[PDB]
Amino acid sequence: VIHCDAATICPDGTTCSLSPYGVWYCSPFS
Numbered sequence: 001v002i003h004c005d006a007a008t009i010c011p012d013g014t015t016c017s018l019s020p021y022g023v024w025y026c027s028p029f030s
Contacts, residue, residue, distance in 0.1 A: 002026065 004016030
């Protein structure tokens with residue numbers, strides 16, 4: 001899994017990103 005912050009994690013084929021509600025997660029890029 002990928003990382004960028006410190007707690008939240010990221011699956012495969014995605015990029016760490018922050019939600020508009022302050023939610024840390026990974027989005028599918030292409």
